[PDB]
Amino acid sequence: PFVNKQFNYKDPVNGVDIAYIKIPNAGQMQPVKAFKIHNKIWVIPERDTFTNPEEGDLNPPPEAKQVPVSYYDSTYLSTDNEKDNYLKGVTKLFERIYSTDLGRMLLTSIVRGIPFWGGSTIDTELKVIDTNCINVIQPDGSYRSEELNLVIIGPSADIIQFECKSFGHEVLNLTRNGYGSTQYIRFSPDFTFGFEESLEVDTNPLLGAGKFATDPAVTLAHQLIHAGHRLYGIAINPNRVFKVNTNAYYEMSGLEVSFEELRTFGGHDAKFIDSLQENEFRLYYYNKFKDIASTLNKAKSIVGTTASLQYMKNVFKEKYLLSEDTSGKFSVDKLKFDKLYKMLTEIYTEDNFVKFFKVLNAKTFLNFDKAVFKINIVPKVNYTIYDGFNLRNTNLAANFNGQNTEINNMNFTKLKNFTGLFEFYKLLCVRNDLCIKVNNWDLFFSPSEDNFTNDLNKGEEITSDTNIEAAEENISLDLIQQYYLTFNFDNEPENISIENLSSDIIGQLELMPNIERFPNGKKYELDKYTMFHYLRAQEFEHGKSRIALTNSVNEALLNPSRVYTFFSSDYVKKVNKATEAAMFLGWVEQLVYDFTDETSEVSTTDKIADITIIIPYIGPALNIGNMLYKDDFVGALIFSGAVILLEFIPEIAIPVLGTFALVSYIANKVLTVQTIDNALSKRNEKWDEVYKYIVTNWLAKVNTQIDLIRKKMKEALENQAEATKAIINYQYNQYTEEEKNNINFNIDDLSSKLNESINKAMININKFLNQCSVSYLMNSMIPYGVKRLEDFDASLKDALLKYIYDNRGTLIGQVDRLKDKVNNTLSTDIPFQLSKYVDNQRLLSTFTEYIKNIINTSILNLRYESNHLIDLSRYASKINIGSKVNFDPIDKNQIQLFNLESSKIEVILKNAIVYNSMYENFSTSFWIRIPKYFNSISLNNEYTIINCMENNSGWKVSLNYGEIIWTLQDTQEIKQRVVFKYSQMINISDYINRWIFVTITNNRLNNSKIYINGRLIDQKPISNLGNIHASNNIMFKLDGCRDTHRYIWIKYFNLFDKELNEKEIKDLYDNQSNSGILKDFWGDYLQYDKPYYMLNLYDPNKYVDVNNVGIRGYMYLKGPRGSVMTTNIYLNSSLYRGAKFIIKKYASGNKDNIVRNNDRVYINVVVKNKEYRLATNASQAGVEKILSALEIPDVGNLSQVVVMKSKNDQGITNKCKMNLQDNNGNDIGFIGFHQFNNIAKLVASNWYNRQIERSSRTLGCSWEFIPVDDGWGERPL
């Protein structure tokens, strides 16, 4: 820390702060020269050759160590100069670390570390473990033992194998027992690791060129964070490793991250460790301290120094944050411990440092380094304490340029990795065997299910004084700030003179686990091609090959010029074809554009709330489609969901949650009323544990994969840009030889381009990915955990209601409110807040948008997507569709079901995901389309359309002559039904043969409501209905319809696991109305070329009629619209009356024949088997324009274009649908009628236009198109 005096290697040894140290090693050891950069921190610029006897050889091994990166240089740090530079650097980084709040604290804990005085010399005595000191050679040839705390030596063989090294004890785990011991950090500030980014792009649009460098400070900071743990004897056993599955072509051959490694990194990595294991350690170390206190508390004497036993007892007092009374006895204050621990453990972590140092760095410990670099930090021009590489001013600070080894090329010297490229690998063969050498450190992680401990099954007794939950302070910079303030920076252990130790302190390193070499080669003969294969097929041989030509098909990895793409053929074309230099730059522009073009493709799939943004080429870039129902990734993903991306499917074991036992109290109100609260509280907490748990499982099994892909793609895209830089290159590589011609093709600029083109591409791919992650979590992992909670919840309620009962008379004046409190709480879940377990601004932000759409909420949501009737909410397991089930050809999401027992759709919901307390509070909505009841059979015949019962298992939608019903019924067969009844004796109905939005709400504690088209039609209490079954499957089929020709049309069936409120209902309702599409009088999308009868909503009793064809003729509303009936059944004004209307395309055609909100169209009036053209003369007289049915060829420049409408300019629905316009583009007006001497000719008046703005009064322009419909048995006269 800080380091007071600037050293130089040659500076004369002086017994202190610069001496000839004799580290505690084994056997003899010529003293080594080390400096004291600070109280308790020495620096030996030698290669760690001493610490380990079996490590004196600094030469590389004929066999490579299974590590992604390695580097050797027997000669490194040999010269006396190198030492000095090493000295200069190790320091500068301490200064770097030290110049940060976080840094500052850590170095104070490290210096304060001080290995406990074990040396167990007689219980009661205190003593120094000589292995924690060093002998310091004084000038006069003497030597005085000195206590040490942390030492920095040079790297051993493998230069970049930085690590913490401590000497062990004969019988003590000085690193895992609380004692702590002097640490020897093998570190070098002359080499770094290069890594690649593929996220920051979101914030940094112009992110660096390629591989970035890792600020040495972080690395050092990472290593100290380790010395910290060890100094405080809190290091996790290195026998604790996150097991990894290896057998699989996609799995990582070998890799064993330690918990203490995942711990030290922090970020999410640290979240891989389940809560149960987390607290396992805590208590473990919390007890190590308790013994420290004990050890101290009974220490009478102290052999060794001339420092007061009190002094000593105090150092360790101030170290471990012990608390002592007046007698001087020590104790471990749990609450105070949790803090110290929390600090050494979660505040001080690599990720947290990456915040203080504002540098770019790996965002996970599982992001394997791909390089080594020779850096030189000493010169300020290179690296500064404050800015590092990203120097102020310098063009390095805009986008971690200083860290970009390519941009800041001058500061990074690409060295030779010593792990080839296929050292550790896997052999992947397709089905010409067709295999590929896939790099080990290039395969998938894949945590072993073992790792995820749990313990969620243990039930629990809930006394009255149980201890309630605790936050999950995500260690925000704010919390750090707090810690900083409350941080104690003054006073640092004195250099307590200890009595000389052995001239040769006997060492012996703590024993690290053995490096289990891992198998290599391992062959994999597979079926389908792999993402690895595809990726492979996009690299192509360096360059000395023949001008490679892009070419689809995986066989694109058989030719020496093996290259493949996921781009549109045309690109292939443009690229694969000679281009005369006369015309070259054009080409460049072309490709670039086309690149940046193809590369930015994003599907909106708005009609799919869940995963909005979509990058289609992903499927064919990584062959992600996983081969399903043949191609169409964007359709593939939709049919399955983000699952189609996982190289492997993670499971979620969420045991049958235990239960709370309730300790009862005899005639003790308080104590009782307090237990119920503790019960409920712990339950709340109970939900948190589960959520937090699946987030850990989601964080390592799922999210990790998605991230690999995230890289993979980024890899892909580059593989492409790299070739299009090859090809294009080859061309100009055979240039005309004419200088001055073109400001150079600037390959180092076309690249600057292709860079951006890809950088943005990733911005899209990333969003897309983030969605598949969050989303996958929400519909494939949470549901499971929830089920169990909801179960638990369902149980606890009883257990609680009972408790209350069993204790009434003691809960005298409260046996109701408590009964209400328990019933009120345990009647709704505990929302899953992702922010409670994740800081990730990326994912949370995502999670937020996902939550906004109430649809992603639904436990069942089935639309007709792509080519299937699927349950986008991923709850259904098998959606069996009948054979007599028809799907409207237009909007196939409109299902029609007949009376035939063969037309039916049954949906079964994944059992594991289905809890029986599922239908207490829940809503259901769907759009209905009921034909008209013509017969009388229909009367008093209630057929059922939607049924979900398991022997009296409530709710099943039924129909009966002019009414829709919803009946709830419990096992105790008590049933309650709410009904919406619609008369069939109306001129014009709002429900007959039309589409009706229906939503049914259910609140166990309240009533069952039925909403028709948004408004509440009726409600009936249900606070009396007993328990209800949770039917595993729902059946869509009419049942008991005596009518033979009865059928219905359902649409947008959804099922919500909560009581949708009015607002929600109305929102949901407006959303499923496709306001951008005009409608049938019955609700279908209006359509082009499809004769409709006009029904004027203002004067429903009339009907359009063409007085006389021609401009000298007119159209008007004719007399009395006939009636229709069938005594005792219906008496509706007739519809299929008057002249038909035919909408003709005019703007954007050939496309679907659906008429959309703002289409310019043509209205052909069909007069006497002939079709004319409704037009007018915008040059008439008044505002009104009479309109006539002209002869299509005689129309000419007359006003005929009608702008169809659906949403008022303001945005409000309006019936006024036809706005006529003059060719000049003007606005002649909406079409309506108008009295002209008691004739009311159809007219296009600009009046409505005006009114439609103001009010929303049904106006004379309130038209309605009526096609003939099998639902309206009426016969078109």
**Vertex 908 angle, CA 888 and 882, to 5°:** 35
- The three-state DSSP-derived secondary structure of 345-412 is HHHCCHHHHHHHCCCCCCCCCCCCCCCCEECCCCCCCCCECCCECCCCCCCCCCCCHHHECCCCHHHC
Parallel, antiparallel, or unpaired for β 32-38 and 41-47? antiparallel
d(CA 167, CA 598): 58
- Chain Cα centroid distance, residue 842: 8
Total length of the chain? 1277
**Which DSSP string do the residues of 166-182 spell out, in sequence order?**
-B--SS--TTTSS----
H-helix or E-strand containing 83? helix 80-98
Q: With beta carbons less than 8 A apart as the criterion, state whether 1201 and 1145 touch.
A: no
Nearest alpha carbon to residue 43 among 105, 79, 92: 92
Residue in this structure with the two tokens 């006009």, named with its chain if needed: 1094
Question: Could you tell me which residues come within 8 angstroms of residue 614 by beta carbon, excluding any fewer than 6 positions away?
Answer: 602, 603, 604, 605, 634, 637, 768
924 SS3 class: strand
Nearest alpha carbon to residue 275 among 704, 703, 784, 689: 689
Q: With beta carbons less than 8 A apart as the criterion, state whether 661 and 461 touch.
A: yes
d(CA 68, CA 957): 62
Q: With beta carbons less than 8 A apart as the criterion, state whether 832 and 719 touch.
A: no
d(CA 332, CA 323): 6
Q: What are 84-88's contacts with CB under 8 Å, separation 24+?
A: 84/8, 84/9, 84/10, 84/45, 85/190, 85/376, 85/378, 86/45, 86/154, 86/188, 86/189, 86/190, 87/7, 87/8, 87/9, 87/35, 87/43, 87/45, 88/378
User: Gaps after which residues in the chain, C–N over 2.5 Å?
Assistant: 431
Question: Could you tell me which residues come within 8 angstroms of residue 153 by beta carbon, excluding any fewer than 6 positions away?
Answer: 44, 45, 46, 47, 48, 50, 51, 184, 185, 186, 187
Burial (CB count <10 Å: 0-12, 13-18, 19+), residue 1230: buried
Nearest alpha carbon to residue 543 among 361, 319, 730: 730
Question: Could you tell me which residues come within 8 angstroms of residue 555 by beta carbon, excluding any fewer than 6 positions away?
Answer: none
For 331, other C-beta atoms within 10 Å of its C-beta total 15
Q: With beta carbons less than 8 A apart as the criterion, state whether 208 and 407 touch.
A: yes
Q: With beta carbons less than 8 A apart as the criterion, state whether 1146 and 1220 touch.
A: no
d(CA 901, CA 1046): 12
The gap between the terminal CA atoms of the chain, to the nearest Å, is 98
423 annotated as a binding-site residue: no
868 annotated as a binding-site residue: no
Q: Which two tokens stand for residue 490?
A: 């003054």
In 472-549 the beta strands, taken as DSSP E runs, fall at 523-526
169 annotated as a binding-site residue: no
Residue in this structure with the two tokens 């948190």, named with its chain if needed: 688
For 288, other C-beta atoms within 10 Å of its C-beta total 20
Question: Could you tell me which residues come within 8 angstroms of residue 232 by beta carbon, excluding any fewer than 6 positions away?
Answer: 109, 113, 178, 180, 319, 320, 340, 344
d(CA 1094, CA 307): 105
Strand partners, 146: 134
Strand partners, 979: 965
- Binding-site residues, in ranges, read 222, 226, 261
- Binding-site residues for Zn(2+), in ranges, read 222, 226, 261
